[PDB]
Every structure is written in structure tokens, then in C-alpha cells.
Amino acid sequence: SNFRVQPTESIVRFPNITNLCPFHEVFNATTFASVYAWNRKRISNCVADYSVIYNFAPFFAFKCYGVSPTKLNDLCFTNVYADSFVIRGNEVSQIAPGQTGNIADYNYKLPDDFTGCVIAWNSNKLDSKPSGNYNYLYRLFRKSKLKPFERDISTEIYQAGNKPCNGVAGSNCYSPLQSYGFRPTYGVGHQPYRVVVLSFELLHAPATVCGPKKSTNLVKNKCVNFNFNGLTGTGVLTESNKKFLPFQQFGRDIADTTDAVRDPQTLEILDITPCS
Amino acid sequence: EVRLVESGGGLVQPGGSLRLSCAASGFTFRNYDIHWVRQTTGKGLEWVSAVGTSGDTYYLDSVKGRFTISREDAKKSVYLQMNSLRAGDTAMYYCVRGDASPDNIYYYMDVWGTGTRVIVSSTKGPSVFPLAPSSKSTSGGTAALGCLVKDYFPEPVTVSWNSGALTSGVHTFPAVLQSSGLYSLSSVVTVPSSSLGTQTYICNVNHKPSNTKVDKKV
Amino acid sequence: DIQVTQSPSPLSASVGDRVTITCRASQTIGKYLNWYHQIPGKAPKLLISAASTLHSGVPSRFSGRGSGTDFTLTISSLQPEDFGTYYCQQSYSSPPWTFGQGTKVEIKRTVAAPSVFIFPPSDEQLKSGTASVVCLLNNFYPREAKVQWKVDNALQSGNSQESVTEQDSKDSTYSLSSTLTLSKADYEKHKVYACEVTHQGLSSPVTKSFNR
């Protein structure tokens, strides 16, 4: 008979794991937004690589609500809406599916089916101007409860009752925007904390933000399976002194056979060899 | 088939630093996330302190800082180093392979491991205290010859009521540790009211760790 | 956060019965729950995942149910290996994967009665300084019996700890053993030690006491 060697492993690689994805600005900038005016950003049409999210300042929270925080890089999501806003310390626990209060009841309320990850961290150095940075406001005294992902940027004077107040303020009348005091004198729980709530919408339509490719290693001098770049195959991999002119991806011999793959994400001249 | 060894051991003192390990044997170490569950004898499977292939390293808020997870695919094992431990980390540590369904998100921690053990106290020599049921003011035909082994520590201790003459009796009571830090079990035997007068019913102890095979009857 | 209130701690059972283990959440966690089984002296294993999808190897009518906050492990048929501690785990929690409190499904027999014996400490134990009086409560199925160390007609407890062994194999009863740990002066000055056995098994609480 004719006994051969069967491919030991199935180590493969892909042309660059991921592309440039905008996981900054809503995650890393200066002035963010305000609770009353939650921002938004529909990231799509890009290979979502959530690895940059982890290599960031020790955060004060990473609670994922519905999705395993370890499988974000492997689930094809349809849309992801990043929402950034700066709240205080005692309000970090209020932003969560099913929790009420006064900063998540009328300012920003998440549904009871919110399949996302809330990310919070301390910002007592970038958004803590002395004497109190009064630029941030938080909405209060809403006529009714808020809805999942509902904006409230009105500034009409609201009163408790039986008090005419249209454009002027008073004792029982106040504007629906109150400043936040960000001073180092204030203890923990009153400092500014930035929160970005990635809302991963899970559906059945073609996903526009899939996770990065599973490019493995480059086991050499050992018979293995191959998917380098996109062609499938099987064989041993050596190191050749050939010089594919800067454009030639695959290689070929005098028999129309794949015989030299180019390191997808390492720009190198490997040479495929037969598994006897 | 698919086992998870947990050869880490533990005998640290307050303020020590032990290092555990969980080496798999039966699947892609890479394509799987290894956590670390903990069970206090008399409590519920605790936190996770999980590690991931994307280099994600998770911790508990009440264990963060004094903990550091590390995945090393070279030897197909992970590690769990801890800083100064208090008196509340004495428990049976475990390592699990938390996984969800294909693209579904139901983490079901399916492949559990062996069982590492941590302690943070001292030890002593077994103090056997005989209990004589000479007062037959009992229910009649029911003797309860017991030997209270007190002031010892390592759980591996056994109270052979005579090999062979153990005769379906040895009731090894769970070591009731006195706050001190010394353990105290108990072992009564199911003997008739005349067996308290039949043969040398001895409570041969066998304290192994502190090295003291001790004996004596009642 | 998201808590889970499993069934009351002790769930009596017979080899064949409809056992209901309730797991109620503080929110609407939809269909994110995992049921486990931890037998005494071994590592836990998965039984029901994603509310109703049994994993594998769990086939003994270990049916799950529920799709909101309250979920129930309907065990319609029980075997010796269907007895042990059960745990719930809301997958809707992620970073702090929180497990349940624990529900021990035990076996059932009849009602019994405590065969007891107060046990004065060793002679040399007092010269050692210490002392240990033991109240053996043996052969009792209703494991709710308490120990009241009555030193000289006074409830001078606080230092006596007790424990129970694993449920007997062919007897199904439990065994209790408290240890009155006091000093030598506290022993050679007192004479009444009635161990009040307030158990549901016996009709009248028996109090055995030794005298010096």
C-alpha cells in the first residue's frame, strides 16, 4: 500500500486579523458629553476588534449585560451604538438594566433587554477643573418616565404645581439642568466618571460589525492544514529566498499548483512542500 | 478524556502568597476560557477571576489587587498568584472551563476540575479524651464509647476504633474547630451495654500529618 | 444586583417524586440560567443550561422550565444519584458570574427519636485545664434538634459548637455532637448539666444531666 503522513494540526492565518475600527473618541477624548445629552455613534461596516477596549486604564466597571464578556470578539453583531456621558460616583450603579433612581430614571434609561457592556472609569484628572466644573448638567423633574434610549434636551421651566412659571425661576420653580461639582475636596462617590455603554444589537440580518479573524500562528517544518490568505490546502512550510515582486500574493510552479504562500500578516516568503 | 488537574497546594500563613495551577488535558486550551471557582466548606461556589485568549483578565471587586491571573499556553496551563491573604480565603479552590453555545451567550461552566485546598492557621498534637459510659442510665443495650481527639489540625486524621473491632460504629463527627485554630473531631461506636465489658474496644487514632500514630481504648 | 432565591435549604424526597427547585431572580433575566449539581465529596457538574437545554449526560427526567425571573427544576423521577446540592447561575450578570445559595435534596424515611448520652470530660482533662462534655443526639430524621447546655439551671451557652455527619446510607438518620468547652473552675463548681434535647421526633424533650 502507500501510507502517508496526515496533517498534524490545522494552524491557519488571514490577511491582517482586523482593519482600522473607530474604538476611540467615544472611548478616549477630552470633554465627553452630558447625562442630559447622551451622545451616540453607530459603528458599522468594519471588523470590530474589541481588544483595544481591554488595554485601557484600570476601569471601575465592565459589566456586560446579556453577552459573555469573553466572547465579544467572536459574535457578529448587526449594530453597536456607543453612548458616552459623564456622571458622578454614586450614579455608576444606577445605569443598569432594571435599576431606577434620578440619573437613570429621566436622564438615560436602558431597557430590560439591553444586550451590552457598560464601561466606566475615573476621570478626576481630565474633567475636574478647580472651583467646580459646572459645564455638566443632569436632567431632573420629567413629566413622565423615560424610554429606552430617549433624548431629553429641553430647557423649559418646570414647577411642582399651582405656580405660574414660564420664563422666570423662583423657589418652587427651577430649570431642568443642574450643575455638577467636580472638586478634589469632595470624597469618593462625587467625582466625575465617564461611562460608555456599547449597545450590541443582535439580530438575524447580515451583521456589519463582526469580530476579528482567528489568525493562528505559523508552525513551520511540520505537515499541517493551511488557509493562508484565503486558499485552503495542506502541507509543510519552509523558508525560501524568493522575492515576490511587491504585489504577487500566491505562488505557482510549472504545473499550476499553489507552491509559495506569502505570510499574510508578516510579509515573508514561505514555500509549501509535499506531505509524504 | 477531558480532565483539569489542579496541582497547586496550599499551607500559607496570614500574609503569605501561594501559586496555583490548572493544566488541561483533552481540548484546545486556546479555544476555551479558564475561570477559577472557590467553595468554602459551608458556602457556595464563589467568584470566577476568569482569563481569556484575547488577554482579557477579569477579577472580583473584593479580590482585585491581591490577585493576578496569567494564561500561559506554552505548558497548556494557567496560574493564579495571590498577594497577602486574610483569614477568609481558606477554601477548596477549583478551575472550570466556562463556555457558551456556538454563537449563543449562555455561559454554562461545564468542565470542572479536581480540588485545590488552602488553609491559614496552625497545628498541634492530638489530645485523645476518653468518654466512659459507666453510668448505665442509658436506654439499655446501647453503649457509646467515644474518644474526643482534640487540639489537632490537618483534616487528614482518622479514628480507627480497632481495625476489625471498628465493628460498624466509628461515627467520625465533622471536626468542630474551636475558634483558637485547633480542630476537634469525635468518634463514638455502636456497641451493646455489655460490650462496655466485652473486649478491648480501643480507639486507635492515626494522626498522620503531625506524625503521631496514637491509640489507647476508653 | 441580580439575586436568586432558591428553594428553602432542606428538601426531603423519596425515590420517585415531583421535586420543585425554585429559582426567582430580582429582575427579568429572560432565559439566562444554568442549573448545577454538587454531590458531597466531588466537583459540581452541569445539569440544565439556558433554562431548558440539558447539556449531556443529565438524562434522568431532569427537566427544566421557566422563561423570565422564576425557573423550576422539575425532577419527576429520583434515583440515589439525583440527591445532592443544586445551584442556579444567572448568565445575565457576566463579570461577577453569581451562583445560588444551595438546596440539598435528601432522602425520606419515618419519624424517629434521639438515643442520647451526656458525657462528662476526661479526668486528666480538668488538670490539663480544659473540659469537654458531649451531648450525643443519635438516630434522628427531623434534623432540627437544638442543644441547650443548662449549666446549674442557667442557659450558659455560647462556647459549645455542634456538627452533623453525612446522611446515613442504610439508616437515613443524622448524628449530632456538641462539645461544652469551659474551664476547670467552671466544671468543679457546677453540678447540673441537663442537655435539653428539643427535637420534633420524641414527644417530650428529654434532659439528661450528670452530677459530680
Numbering used by the authors:
A (entry chain A): 316 to 591
B (entry chain H): 1 to 218
C (entry chain L): 1 to 212
Excerpt from the publication:
In this study, we reported the isolation of potent and broadly neutralizing mAbs from a vaccinated donor with a special five-dose COVID-19 vaccination schedule. One mAb, named PW5-570, displayed the most potent neutralizing activity against all SARS-CoV-2 strains prior to BA.5 variant, and another three mAbs, named PW5-4, PW5-5, and PW5-535 were found to broadly neutralize all sarbecoviruses tested, including all the current SARS-CoV-2 variants, SARS-CoV, Pangolin-GD, RaTG13, WIV-1, and SHC014. Cryo-EM analysis demonstrates that these antibodies have diverse neutralization mechanisms, such as disassembling spike trimers, or binding to RBM or SD1 to affect ACE2 binding.
We also determined the structures of PW5-535 complexed with the stabilized prefusion ectodomain of Omicron XBB S (6 P) and SARS-CoV S (2 P). In XBB S–PW5-535 complex, PW5-535 binds to a hidden epitope in RBD outside the RBM, buries a surface area of 961 Å2 and involves a total of 17 RBD residues. Besides, Y58 of CDRH2, P95, P96, W97 of CDRL3 forms hydrophobic interaction with Y369 and P384. The R30 of CDRH1 interacts with the T531 of subdomain 1 (SD1) by the van der Waals force. The binding epitope of PW5-535 is similar to the class IV antibody AB-3467, which is located in the hidden surface and around residues such as Y369, F377, K378, Y380, P384, etc.
